[PDB]
Every structure is written in structure tokens, then in C-alpha cells.
């Protein structure tokens, strides 16, 4: 296993956002041309095993451990009735105190805040990606497509990401092979070598959140200089067309940096190889 491996994301110009927004309130529009310098992106979401190496090295206590709770989705035992703040839910205990990660070492780490993610990435000689870097990487060398692989959800009749099937939130059929998370190396890679960039765990980025974007061309944009919420991308194993249609590269959402939940993780980036 090489679950901390990085891939080179080539220099290029891409269209960020879309002029056909599907969730207009999230500022998916307008489409804008962004230039990104070559850099490196983690192939995989950070796994439990990789996060444990960080904790073993540093002794780091995550914010959820310090606060004493984190958000867990009801269907696997708030902003919605299906989100419960559970005492003792944290990265080692993803559904609460009597859950464990022993049987899912290769699944993405969860219940990690933006600060937790920045601590890990920096420990590793890396950083969080910007939203623009993230989206560029998600798109995997294709222009103006819904998903990393194209516009069809199940190309060639194959599942390409871990999201929800069935009637959310009552019934997840597990048609794609996973009710909760999947290993970080599950499903096909995109054109750049990235796994689970949409679906599985949501992913933190470095940017502060705004929904107000200029159409102006930009170079290595960092997002606005201030804010209250940081940007997350890509959707999760909970996402579905019917309620949280955010397993698209253009999609975007946000949380306060001290937030944590059972569907939110991250991957790192770096200017050069560490």
C-alpha cells in the first residue's frame, strides 16, 4: 500500500464553475477561466492508517476529541434531523464510542476539522489544495463535464464513485458496493490518477467560502481573504441527485473550520514532492 502517494497535476488553464449551475445558491456560476501552475495532489483521501501515523508521531488530539462530540448520520447508528451530535464520535469512533476503525484502516479518515486537516497536511510536508486546484484536479483533464469521468453517472453501466442509491435518508441500497465509506483506493481513477475525488468523503480545501465570483481570469487563485466558513468539495457516500447533488466537480459547500462529521475528510496537495 502506498496510500500517501501523490500524482503530478499538470500546468494548465481550465473553466472553473459552470454557466449551467445546478445549485444556483452555492455560486456554481459563473464559469471562469483559471490558470493553475503544475503541482502535486494526493491520489487518495487521507486514510485512517495514514492519520494514525500522524497521531502516533505528534500526539495530536483532534478538535472533535476535545469538544467531546461530532456529527453522525442517523442511518448509521444539527443541519437536518438525520444529523445528530454524538458524544464520543470522532476519527477513531466514527459512529460513537462503541464503533471502531480496526476493520476499516484503509477507509478515509472522518470527523476531522479544517484545522485537523491543515495540521496533518503540514506535518506531512504538504498543504490543503485551493478550491481551484481541487476542482481542476477533480475534472481530470476534461472540459465542462459534470463528473471527473464525463457526463453519465454510470458510464458503461459501471459505478464510478461511492454515493447513495435508493431513497435518501430512509434506504441506501448499497448498489455501488458500499453503504458507508469505501477504501481510499476504491473505484476507477480519474484522468489524473485521483481516486474518490467525488463521493466517499467530502474534502476540505484551503479557501474561505464566498458565493460571489468575478468572471475575470485568474492565476492560482486563493479565494477571498476573509470569511467565516471554509470550502469543501466533491460530495460523499451520502450524496444523491434528489437532495445533495454535489458529487460534481463544480459543486461546492462549506462549514466553519472547527466542524467535523461522519462524511467529511480531506486529501493534501504540495508545490513539490515532500
Amino acid at each position: 500500500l502506498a496510500h500517501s502517494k501523490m500524482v503530478p497535476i499538470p500546468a494548465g488553464v481550465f473553466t472553473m464553475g459552470t454557466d449551467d449551475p445546478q445549485i444556483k445558491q452555492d455560486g456554481e456560476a459563473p464559469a471562469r477561466r483559471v490558470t493553475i501552475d503544475a503541482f502535486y495532489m494526493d491520489a487518495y483521501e487521507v486514510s485512517n492508517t495514514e492519520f494514525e501515523k500522524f497521531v502516533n508521531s505528534t500526539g495530536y488530539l483532534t478538535e472533535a476529541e476535545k469538544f467531546g462530540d461530532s456529527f453522525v448520520f442517523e442511518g448509521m447508528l444539527a443541519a437536518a434531523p438525520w444529523w445528530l451530535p454524538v458524544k464520543g464520535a470522532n476519527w477513531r469512533h466514527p459512529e460513537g464510542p462503541d464503533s471502531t476503525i480496526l476493520h476499516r484502516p484503509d477507509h478515509p479518515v472522518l470527523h476531522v476539522s479544517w484545522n485537523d486537516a491543515v495540521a496533518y497536511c503540514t506535518w506531512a510536508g504538504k498543504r490543503l489544495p485551493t478550491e481551484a486546484e481541487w476542482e481542476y484536479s477533480c475534472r481530470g483533464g476534461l472540459h465542462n463535464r459534470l463528473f471527473p469521468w464525463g457526463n453519465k453517472l454510470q458510464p458503461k453501466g459501471q459505478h464510478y464513485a461511492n454515493i447513495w442509491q435508493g431513497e435518501f435518508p430512509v434506504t441506501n441500497t448499497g448498489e455501488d458496493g458500499f453503504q458507508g465509506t469505501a477504501p481510499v483506493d476504491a473505484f476507477p481513477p480519474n484522468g489524473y490518477g485521483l481516486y474518490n475525488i467525488v463521493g466517499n468523503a467530502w474534502e476540505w480545501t484551503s479557501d474561505w467560502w464566498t458565493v460571489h465570483h468575478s468572471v475575470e481570469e485568474t492565476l492560482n487563485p486563493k479565494g477571498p481573504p476573509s470569511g467565516k466558513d471554509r470550502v469543501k468539495k466533491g460530495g460523499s457516500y451520502m450524496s444523491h441527485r434528489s437532495y445533495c447533488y454535489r458529487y460534481r466537480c463544480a459543486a461546492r459547500s462549506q462549514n466553519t473550520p472547527d466542524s467535523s462529521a461522519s462524511n467529511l475528510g480531506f486529501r493534501c496537495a504540495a508545490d513539490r514532492l515532500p
Binding site: 443541519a79 462549514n255 466542524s259 462524511n263
Partner: peptide
């Protein structure tokens, strides 16, 4: 999709 703390 994820509630804030």
C-alpha cells in the same frame, strides 16, 4: 450536506 459545529 454536513452541519456546522
Amino acid at each position: 450536506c454536513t452541519p456546522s459545529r
